[PDB]
Amino acid sequence: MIVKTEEELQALKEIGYICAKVRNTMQAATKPGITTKELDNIAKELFEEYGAISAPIHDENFPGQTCISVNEEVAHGIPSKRVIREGDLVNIDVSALKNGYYADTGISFVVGESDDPMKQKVCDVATMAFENAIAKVKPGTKLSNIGKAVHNTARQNDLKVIKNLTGHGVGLSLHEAPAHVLNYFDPKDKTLLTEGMVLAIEPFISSNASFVTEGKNEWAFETSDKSFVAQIEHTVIVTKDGPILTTKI
Numbered sequence: 526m527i528v529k530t531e532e533e534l535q536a537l538k539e540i541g542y543i544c545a546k547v548r549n550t551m552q553a554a555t556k557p558g559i560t561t562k563e564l565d566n567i568a569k570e571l572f573e574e575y576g577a578i579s580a581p582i583h584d585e586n587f588p589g590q591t592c593i594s595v596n597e598e599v600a601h602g603i604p605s606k607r608v609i610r611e612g613d614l615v616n617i618d619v620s621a622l623k624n625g626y627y628a629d630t631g632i633s634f635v636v637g638e639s640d641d642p643m644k645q646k647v648c649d650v651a652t653m654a655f656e657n658a659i660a661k662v663k664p665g666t667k668l669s670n671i672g673k674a675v676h677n678t679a680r681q682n683d684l685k686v687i688k689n690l691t692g693h694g695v696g697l698s699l700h701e702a703p704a705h706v707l708n709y710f711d712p713k714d715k716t717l718l719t720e721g722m723v724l725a726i727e728p729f730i731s732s733n734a735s736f737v738t739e740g741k742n743e744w745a746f747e748t749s750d751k752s753f754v755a756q757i758e759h760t761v762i763v764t765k766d767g768p769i770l771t772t773k774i
């Protein structure tokens with residue numbers, strides 16, 4: 526959406542806070558021996574407490590408050606009896622609405638220690654990619670400069686991006702214009718950011734695969750080669766004074 530009023534801004538900051546709070550709490554609770562359903566239950570309880578509702582359930586009838594994706598799963602993982610183990614690469618993606626306004630945020634992290642430092646590496650580089658992407662964000666700038674930054678960051682670190690996952694406009698719905706914020710540069714795209722524009726920016730950084738495929742069920746996205754992939758996602762408002770992240774605390 527385009528923010529035009531204080532009251533819209535306040536609504537967006539409110540639901541952004543809630544999603545960040547849920548995301549942080551779930552991440553903190555993630556340890557060997559907990560199931561992803563147990564983690565999802567944390568979101569259930571905090572969403573209720575803060576008067577928000579799950580965006581995956583509301584907008585998509587997703588079977589879970591949040592999306593929790595582990596190891597082979599990159600995105601859209603269904604919380605379940607799956608138990609977290611030492612070394613797991615976990616993505617927790619939290620999106621929700623309150624009073625008609627939305628936020629969307631996500632983080633990948635390593636549980637304890639993996640035997641393969643690449644899991645942390647893709648996490649490190651996803652964080653860098655996000656930072657580099659938003660350095661480029663102001664009214665009038667090319668949407669495609671976001672993907673350019675993300676892919677450049679990947680390349681600088683001998684990594685790849687997931688080309689067929691994207692960011693999106695967000696605000697009055699989970700997904701609205703601009704339809705796709707790419708993780709790479711499209712020379713032909715003349716779409717610009719504007720004052721007040723709200724975007725979910727979510728770089729996916731991969732150790733090998735450049736795309737995801739259908740996974741173990743109707744929802745999960747995976748890589749067949751079991752690449753390690755990390756996401757960082759925030760909801761961002763484009764302003765003259767710089768980006769405002771509603772989902773950063």
Ligand SMILES: CSCC[C@H](N)C(O)(O)c1nccs1
Pocket residue numbers: 580581585587592600601618619620629630631690691725727758
């Ligand atoms: C299945 S509803 C969850 C969508 C997710 N919040 C998202 O928009 O961040 C992603 N888009 C692509 C991958 S994760």
Ligand SMILES: [Co+2]
Pocket residue numbers: 618619620629630631758
């Ligand atoms: Co998300």
Ligand SMILES: [Co+2]
Pocket residue numbers: 629691692693725727758
């Ligand atoms: Co998203």
Ligand SMILES: [Co+2]
Pocket residue numbers: 691693700
């Ligand atoms: Co999406």
